Short mmCIF file of all heavy atoms in Angstrom, two decimals:
data_model
loop_
_atom_site.label_atom_id
_atom_site.label_comp_id
_atom_site.label_asym_id
_atom_site.label_seq_id
_atom_site.Cartn_x
_atom_site.Cartn_y
_atom_site.Cartn_z
N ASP A 209 110.54 105.49 104.86
CA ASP A 209 111.64 104.69 105.26
C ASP A 209 111.85 104.73 106.71
O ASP A 209 112.13 103.83 107.48
CB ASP A 209 113.05 105.09 104.61
CG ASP A 209 113.05 104.86 103.11
OD1 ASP A 209 112.42 103.86 102.71
OD2 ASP A 209 113.59 105.54 102.44
N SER A 210 111.55 105.99 107.41
CA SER A 210 111.51 106.18 108.80
C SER A 210 110.48 105.34 109.49
O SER A 210 110.69 104.66 110.56
CB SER A 210 111.22 107.63 109.03
OG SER A 210 111.32 107.98 110.46
N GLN A 211 109.29 105.24 108.88
CA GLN A 211 108.12 104.35 109.38
C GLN A 211 108.62 102.91 109.47
O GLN A 211 108.37 102.28 110.54
CB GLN A 211 106.88 104.53 108.47
CG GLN A 211 105.84 103.49 108.61
CD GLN A 211 104.94 103.69 109.89
OE1 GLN A 211 105.39 104.44 110.83
NE2 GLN A 211 103.78 103.06 109.77
N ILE A 212 109.35 102.52 108.38
CA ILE A 212 109.90 101.11 108.29
C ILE A 212 110.91 101.06 109.29
O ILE A 212 111.18 100.03 109.89
CB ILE A 212 110.32 100.69 106.83
CG1 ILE A 212 109.15 100.49 106.00
CG2 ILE A 212 111.12 99.49 106.95
CD1 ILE A 212 109.34 100.38 104.53
N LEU A 213 111.87 102.02 109.40
CA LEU A 213 113.03 102.06 110.28
C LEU A 213 112.63 101.75 111.75
O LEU A 213 113.17 101.03 112.44
CB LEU A 213 113.82 103.32 110.18
CG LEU A 213 115.38 103.33 110.14
CD1 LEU A 213 115.93 102.12 111.05
CD2 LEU A 213 115.84 103.13 108.75
N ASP A 214 111.49 102.50 112.04
CA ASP A 214 110.97 102.41 113.35
C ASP A 214 110.63 100.96 113.80
O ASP A 214 110.96 100.51 114.89
CB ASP A 214 109.80 103.42 113.60
CG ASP A 214 109.23 103.26 114.94
OD1 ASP A 214 108.27 102.42 115.19
OD2 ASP A 214 109.62 104.14 115.96
N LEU A 215 109.79 100.52 112.92
CA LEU A 215 109.20 98.91 113.09
C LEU A 215 110.37 98.01 113.19
O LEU A 215 110.27 97.03 114.00
CB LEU A 215 108.16 98.68 112.10
CG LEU A 215 107.02 99.49 112.01
CD1 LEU A 215 106.22 99.26 110.86
CD2 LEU A 215 106.14 99.45 113.30
N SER A 216 111.34 98.15 112.35
CA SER A 216 112.51 97.18 112.26
C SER A 216 113.27 97.36 113.59
O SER A 216 113.80 96.43 114.23
CB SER A 216 113.35 97.49 111.08
OG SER A 216 112.58 97.55 109.91
N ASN A 217 113.54 98.66 113.99
CA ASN A 217 114.17 98.88 115.32
C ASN A 217 113.39 98.34 116.41
O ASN A 217 113.74 97.50 117.30
CB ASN A 217 114.26 100.41 115.59
CG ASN A 217 115.46 101.06 114.83
OD1 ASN A 217 116.51 100.43 114.85
ND2 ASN A 217 115.18 102.18 114.28
N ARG A 218 112.03 98.56 116.56
CA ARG A 218 111.21 98.17 117.49
C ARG A 218 111.16 96.64 117.68
O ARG A 218 111.12 96.16 118.89
CB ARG A 218 109.62 98.72 117.21
CG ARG A 218 109.34 100.17 117.60
CD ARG A 218 107.88 100.31 118.09
NE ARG A 218 107.79 99.65 119.41
CZ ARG A 218 106.56 99.34 119.97
NH1 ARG A 218 105.39 99.60 119.34
NH2 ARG A 218 106.46 98.83 121.08
N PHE A 219 111.08 95.94 116.60
CA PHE A 219 111.02 94.48 116.54
C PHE A 219 112.36 93.85 117.17
O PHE A 219 112.24 92.99 118.08
CB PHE A 219 110.83 93.94 115.25
CG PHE A 219 110.63 92.54 115.13
CD1 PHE A 219 109.30 91.90 115.36
CD2 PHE A 219 111.68 91.67 115.03
CE1 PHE A 219 109.22 90.53 115.28
CE2 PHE A 219 111.62 90.27 114.76
CZ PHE A 219 110.33 89.75 115.06
N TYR A 220 113.45 94.26 116.77
CA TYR A 220 114.72 93.75 117.22
C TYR A 220 115.01 94.09 118.53
O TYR A 220 115.77 93.40 119.28
CB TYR A 220 115.91 94.17 116.26
CG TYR A 220 115.72 93.57 114.81
CD1 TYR A 220 115.83 94.49 113.74
CD2 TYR A 220 115.49 92.21 114.65
CE1 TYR A 220 115.77 93.89 112.42
CE2 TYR A 220 115.30 91.80 113.29
CZ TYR A 220 115.57 92.59 112.28
OH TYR A 220 115.41 92.22 110.99
N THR A 221 114.53 95.29 119.23
CA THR A 221 114.66 95.63 120.46
C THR A 221 113.87 94.51 121.28
O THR A 221 114.28 94.04 122.27
CB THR A 221 114.12 97.03 120.73
OG1 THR A 221 114.26 97.91 119.62
CG2 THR A 221 115.04 97.63 121.91
N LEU A 222 112.58 94.45 120.85
CA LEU A 222 111.60 93.57 121.60
C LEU A 222 112.05 92.12 121.61
O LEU A 222 111.85 91.46 122.71
CB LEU A 222 110.25 93.67 120.97
CG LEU A 222 109.01 93.72 121.89
CD1 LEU A 222 108.98 94.80 123.06
CD2 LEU A 222 107.71 93.61 121.18
N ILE A 223 112.58 91.69 120.44
CA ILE A 223 113.07 90.26 120.34
C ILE A 223 114.59 90.32 120.03
O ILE A 223 114.85 90.62 118.85
CB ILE A 223 112.23 89.41 119.37
CG1 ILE A 223 110.73 89.37 119.63
CG2 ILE A 223 112.90 88.05 119.11
CD1 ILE A 223 109.87 88.58 118.64
N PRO A 224 115.38 89.92 121.06
CA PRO A 224 116.71 90.02 120.74
C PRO A 224 117.38 89.04 119.79
O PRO A 224 117.15 87.71 119.95
CB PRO A 224 117.37 89.76 122.18
CG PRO A 224 116.29 88.81 122.91
CD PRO A 224 115.07 89.31 122.39
N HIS A 225 117.94 89.53 118.76
CA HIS A 225 118.54 88.56 117.75
C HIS A 225 119.99 88.57 117.79
O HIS A 225 120.70 89.38 118.37
CB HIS A 225 118.15 89.22 116.36
CG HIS A 225 116.76 88.92 115.80
ND1 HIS A 225 115.72 89.02 116.71
CD2 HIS A 225 116.25 88.50 114.73
CE1 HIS A 225 114.63 88.62 116.02
NE2 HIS A 225 114.90 88.41 114.84
N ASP A 226 120.64 87.52 117.11
CA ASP A 226 122.18 87.52 117.12
C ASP A 226 122.67 87.70 115.66
O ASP A 226 122.45 86.61 114.94
CB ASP A 226 122.53 86.08 117.75
CG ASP A 226 124.03 85.98 117.62
OD1 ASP A 226 124.85 86.83 117.58
OD2 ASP A 226 124.54 84.71 117.70
N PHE A 227 123.09 88.79 115.27
CA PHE A 227 123.74 89.01 113.89
C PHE A 227 125.20 89.10 114.06
O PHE A 227 125.92 89.29 113.03
CB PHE A 227 123.18 90.32 113.43
CG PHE A 227 121.72 90.37 113.52
CD1 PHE A 227 121.21 91.46 114.19
CD2 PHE A 227 120.85 89.64 112.65
CE1 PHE A 227 119.79 91.52 114.22
CE2 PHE A 227 119.47 89.66 112.66
CZ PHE A 227 118.84 90.69 113.46
N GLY A 228 125.78 88.83 115.37
CA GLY A 228 127.23 88.95 115.51
C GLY A 228 127.73 90.30 115.30
O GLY A 228 127.30 91.24 116.13
N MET A 229 128.63 90.69 114.52
CA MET A 229 129.32 91.94 114.32
C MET A 229 128.72 92.83 113.14
O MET A 229 129.27 93.86 112.87
CB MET A 229 130.65 91.77 114.19
CG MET A 229 131.53 91.28 115.37
SD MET A 229 131.63 92.51 116.66
CE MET A 229 130.47 91.85 117.69
N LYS A 230 127.65 92.35 112.57
CA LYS A 230 127.01 93.08 111.45
C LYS A 230 125.65 93.70 111.85
O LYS A 230 125.02 93.22 112.77
CB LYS A 230 127.05 92.20 110.22
CG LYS A 230 126.39 90.94 110.35
CD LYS A 230 125.92 90.24 108.96
CE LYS A 230 127.25 89.97 108.20
NZ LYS A 230 126.85 89.21 106.91
N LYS A 231 125.28 94.60 110.98
CA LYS A 231 123.91 95.33 111.26
C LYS A 231 122.71 94.55 111.15
O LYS A 231 122.58 93.72 110.21
CB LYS A 231 123.92 96.64 110.35
CG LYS A 231 124.99 97.58 110.49
CD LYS A 231 125.18 98.56 109.27
CE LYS A 231 124.17 99.64 109.24
NZ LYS A 231 122.74 99.15 108.86
N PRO A 232 121.70 94.79 112.10
CA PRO A 232 120.33 94.31 111.89
C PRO A 232 119.72 94.58 110.59
O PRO A 232 119.60 95.85 110.31
CB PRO A 232 119.58 94.85 112.96
CG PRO A 232 120.60 95.09 114.09
CD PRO A 232 121.89 95.43 113.36
N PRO A 233 119.15 93.67 109.69
CA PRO A 233 118.65 94.02 108.39
C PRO A 233 117.27 94.64 108.55
O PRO A 233 116.53 94.06 109.31
CB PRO A 233 118.71 92.64 107.76
CG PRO A 233 118.51 91.62 108.77
CD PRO A 233 119.21 92.19 109.96
N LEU A 234 117.01 95.58 107.70
CA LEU A 234 115.64 96.20 107.75
C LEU A 234 114.57 95.48 107.20
O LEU A 234 114.79 94.61 106.17
CB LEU A 234 115.75 97.42 106.83
CG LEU A 234 116.68 98.63 107.32
CD1 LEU A 234 117.37 99.19 106.22
CD2 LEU A 234 115.84 99.58 108.13
N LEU A 235 113.44 95.31 107.82
CA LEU A 235 112.28 94.60 107.49
C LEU A 235 111.46 95.33 106.37
O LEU A 235 110.57 96.12 106.69
CB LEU A 235 111.37 94.27 108.71
CG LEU A 235 111.96 93.54 109.81
CD1 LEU A 235 111.00 93.39 110.94
CD2 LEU A 235 112.57 92.22 109.47
N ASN A 236 112.02 95.34 105.12
CA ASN A 236 111.40 96.07 104.13
C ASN A 236 110.64 95.21 102.95
O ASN A 236 109.86 95.70 102.24
CB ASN A 236 112.53 96.86 103.29
CG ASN A 236 113.71 95.97 102.89
OD1 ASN A 236 113.72 94.74 103.06
ND2 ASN A 236 114.74 96.64 102.35
N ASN A 237 110.87 93.90 102.97
CA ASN A 237 110.41 92.89 102.03
C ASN A 237 108.99 92.44 102.51
O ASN A 237 108.63 92.67 103.70
CB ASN A 237 111.34 91.79 101.79
CG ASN A 237 112.64 92.18 101.33
OD1 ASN A 237 113.63 91.81 101.88
ND2 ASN A 237 112.68 93.08 100.21
N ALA A 238 108.28 91.79 101.58
CA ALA A 238 106.98 91.09 102.00
C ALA A 238 107.22 89.79 102.63
O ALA A 238 106.34 89.31 103.40
CB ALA A 238 106.18 90.96 100.65
N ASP A 239 108.20 89.07 102.29
CA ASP A 239 108.58 87.74 102.68
C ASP A 239 109.55 87.67 104.05
O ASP A 239 109.74 86.77 104.71
CB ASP A 239 109.08 86.82 101.70
CG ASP A 239 110.40 87.45 101.03
OD1 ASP A 239 110.84 88.60 101.32
OD2 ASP A 239 110.94 86.74 100.14
N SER A 240 110.19 88.91 104.31
CA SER A 240 111.01 89.12 105.42
C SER A 240 110.19 89.08 106.66
O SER A 240 110.57 88.41 107.69
CB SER A 240 111.82 90.44 105.34
OG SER A 240 110.84 91.54 105.31
N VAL A 241 108.96 89.83 106.76
CA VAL A 241 108.00 89.81 107.68
C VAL A 241 107.37 88.40 107.85
O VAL A 241 107.15 87.92 109.06
CB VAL A 241 106.93 90.78 107.51
CG1 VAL A 241 106.49 91.09 106.20
CG2 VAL A 241 105.59 90.52 108.40
N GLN A 242 107.16 87.69 106.73
CA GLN A 242 106.72 86.39 106.80
C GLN A 242 107.62 85.33 107.49
O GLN A 242 107.30 84.50 108.13
CB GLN A 242 106.31 85.85 105.31
CG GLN A 242 105.75 84.43 105.27
CD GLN A 242 105.57 83.95 104.02
OE1 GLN A 242 105.82 84.64 102.87
NE2 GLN A 242 105.29 82.70 103.73
#
């Protein structure tokens, strides 16, 4: 989960997303990366 947590953190840092007031969702699925 830490391995995944890192890449999810790394991605959203590198590309700024707008989720408003809610948490950035973890990239854990096969189609989420897609």
Side-chain angles (χ1 to χ4, degrees):
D209 293 327
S210 183
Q211 167 76 340
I212 287 168
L213 220 326
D214 177 275
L215 300 168
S216 309
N217 284 316
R218 282 214 70 195
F219 185 86
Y220 297 130
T221 334
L222 211 67
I223 299 181
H225 283 44
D226 178 25
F227 310 115
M229 292 288 102
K230 53 167 65 178
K231 298 162 78 282
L234 294 141
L235 304 179
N236 55 3
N237 303 128
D239 55 359
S240 59
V241 35
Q242 184 184 355

